[PDB]
């Protein structure tokens, strides 16, 4: 499960879809953690955005950022003319305030996300499209 920092507007059709479907999964994990009795103090939350290891733990105190980002994924999803079922954001007010923090990525942090998206593409360019077009070479 990967969270992207790039402009939803610039995601290849495939990464948009992927993200959109995988991000709300975070919300599920914090609900299970909180069902277990965990607090944000119990997670090792990295101070800087990262890609592998504890990439997803990173957003455990960032669910408000995640929620707002869901809105744009859903709307971008729409704008593209994708056939999605689930048109409104998830209510997370059942979750303690401490997990629902906001976040603002440093331009350098976004570049990190950019690259990961950017090298998966070049991996096999013909598997990626944008607005159902093969722009990637």
What does this structure look like?
With 137 residues, this protein is mainly alpha-helical. The chain has a single domain, classed as Endonuclease V (Orthogonal Bundle). The chain contains four helices and no strands.
Structural class: mainly alpha
In oligomeric terms, what are we looking at?
Answer: monomer
The portion of residues assigned to helices is 40-55%
CATH-defined topology = Endonuclease V
Whole-Å distance between the termini?
A: 26 Å
Largest sheet: none
The number of distinct β-strands equals: 0
Number of domains: 1
Q: How many H/I helical runs?
A: 4
CATH uppermost class: Mainly Alpha
Broad shape: globular
Keywords: DNA damage, DNA repair, Endonuclease, Glycosidase, Hydrolase, Lyase, Multifunctional enzyme, Nuclease
Pfam families: Pyr_excise
EC number: 3.2.2.17, 4.2.99.18
GO molecular function: class I DNA-(apurinic or apyrimidinic site) endonuclease activity; deoxyribodipyrimidine endonucleosidase activity; DNA-(apurinic or apyrimidinic site) endonuclease activity; endonuclease activity; pyrimidine dimer DNA N-glycosylase activity
Output the keywords:
monomer, 137 residues, mainly alpha, Endonuclease V, 4 helices, globular, DNA damage
Topology:
Blueprint: H1 13-22, H2 24-36, H3 63-79, H4 107-123
Helix pairs in contact: 1-3
Short description:
With 137 residues, this protein is mainly alpha-helical. Helix content is 42%, strand content 0%.
């Amino acid at each position: 499960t990967r969270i992207n920092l790039t402009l939803v507007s610039e995601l290849a059709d495939q990464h948009l879809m992927a993200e959109y479907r995988q991000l709300p999964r975070v919300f599920g994990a914090v609900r299970k953690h909180v069902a277990n009795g965990k607090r944000v103090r119990d997670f090792k939350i990295s101070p800087t955005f990262i890609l592998g290891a504890g990439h997803v733990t990173f957003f455990y105190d960032k669910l408000e950022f995640l929620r707002k980002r869901q809105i744009e994924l859903i709307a971008e999803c729409l704008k593209r003319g994708f056939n999605i079922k689930d048109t409104t954001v998830q209510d997370i007010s059942d979750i303690p305030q401490e997990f629902r923090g906001d976040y603002i990525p440093h331009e350098a942090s976004i570049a990190i996300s950019q690259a990961r998206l950017d090298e998966k593409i070049a991996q096999r360019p013909t598997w990626y499209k944008y607005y159902g077009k093969a722009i990637y070479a």
